[PDB]
UniProtKB/Swiss-Prot annotation, chain A:
Residues of the full protein shown: 2838 to 3056 of 3175
Active-site residues, as the UniProt record annotates them: H126, H141
Record-given protein name: Uridylate-specific endoribonuclease nsp11
Highest taxon listed in the record's lineage: Viruses
Domain (NendoU) ranges: 95-207
Reaction(s) this enzyme catalyzes, per UniProt: uridylyl-uridylyl-ribonucleotide-RNA = a 3'-end uridylyl-2',3'-cyclophospho-uridine-RNA + a 5'-end dephospho-ribonucleoside-RNA
Function description: Plays a role in viral transcription/replication and prevents the simultaneous activation of host cell dsRNA sensors, such as MDA5/IFIH1, OAS, and PKR. Acts by degrading the 5'-polyuridines generated during replication of the poly(A) region of viral genomic and subgenomic RNAs. Catalyzes a two-step reaction in which a 2'3'-cyclic phosphate (2'3'-cP) is first generated by 2'-O transesterification, which is then hydrolyzed to a 3'-phosphate (3'-P). If not degraded, poly(U) RNA would hybridize with poly(A) RNA tails and activate host dsRNA sensors.
Coiled coil: none
């Protein structure tokens, strides 16, 4: 039954860690899923439902990297990878808008998603200055950037819940890279982990969390 | 190889995971090692340089576990194993004080380095030897301690379970392979109980000290 799923970090930043059917999460008995927040293709009184088609009006379309069983695929820009439906106490509540990883990291690819992203990286070749660590700023680049090593072991860091590489489809940042003022700090989300974007009106920005 | 290197975790805790010339790290092309923070025997605009002799005023001696190529080596007490030199923008930056692992973890040796450490361990039996308090194990904090499992993971400080089969057991106690007498400058504070902020292999640790009694470590 089309065991489709998001990159686990997405559901886990929503606070869902168990799944009776999906393999990317922790195993929980079918029976116990009726009484615990889980991730699944099916529907439960308290769960995050992942489907290919829309379930209801409050289902969130997500253009992102995704999985089908064990196999992980890469975001196709412009199309929905999976629809997210969050059921609480039986009734579905709305999900917050967020940026999403293309899943290039897990795929071992450093390649651009489309020509539109390639023209972006040419237009803003040195946007995205280092990701702000809690105290002092540390270097960060997009996964396609020329300045990254050929090998990115697990000892680098994506923008993921529980040197910094951002795997997000680059033109997703376009709305934030045009502030009316000279400086502007944005409250956003990457894979449903809350982040602060600190942009300069010229072109660039810093990432936080 | 014939090249020298620290125990890979020492460089990693400093923020260096790539190396164009050293085997114990993730490889990187030399052309890229110019613009990327790396560990190396050579010199780069931003790098941690591991040499056999001093290079600069701000070079740091390390009586520590080291490795030549793939082969790991236990430290020799009082003797420098390697000098560390942190370069940032072609400039040498100072390195914080830190205790260092003897490399006994990875060489699987559990004997004392010398007789000084053995005499130290007997002088502080509650913290080094490992006793059975009742139904739990206490003071099995060094690699030469008693009630430790057959295998210990190579870390700055290792959380392992201790046990005397049938009588006692202690889950998740900290075990370190640091040369024991390196703790002596902390064992005599003005207050009876004192907590120190120290570093093991450049990993921020907390040293709890109870005078003339026991001491342990956390991260």
């Amino acid at each position: 039954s089309n065991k489709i799923s998001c990159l686990p970090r997405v559901a886990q930043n929503l606070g869902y860690h168990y799944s009776p059917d999906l393999p990317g999460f922790c195993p929980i008995p079918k029976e116990l899923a009726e009484h615990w927040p889980v991730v699944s293709n099916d529907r439960y009184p308290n769960c995050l439902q992942i489907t290919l088609q829309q379930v209801c009006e409050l289902s969130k379309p997500c253009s992102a990297g995704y999985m089908v069983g064990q196999s992980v695929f890469v975001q196709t820009p412009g199309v929905t990878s999976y629809w997210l439906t969050e059921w609480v106490d039986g009734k579905a509540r709305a999900l917050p808008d967020s940026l999403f990883s293309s899943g290039r990291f897990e795929t071992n690819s450093r390649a651009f998603l489309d020509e539109a992203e390639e023209k972006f990286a040419a237009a803003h070749p040195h946007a995205c200055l280092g990701e702000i660590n809690k105290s002092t700023v540390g270097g960060s680049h997009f996964i396609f950037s020329q300045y990254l090593p050929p090998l990115l072991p697990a000892d680098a860091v994506a923008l993921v819940g529980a040197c910094s590489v951002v795997d997000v489809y680059a033109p997703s940042f376009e709305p934030y890279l045009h502030p009316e003022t000279l400086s502007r700090v944005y409250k956003i989300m990457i894979d449903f982990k809350p982040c602060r974007l600190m942009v300069w009106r010229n072109a660039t920005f810093y990432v936080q969390e």
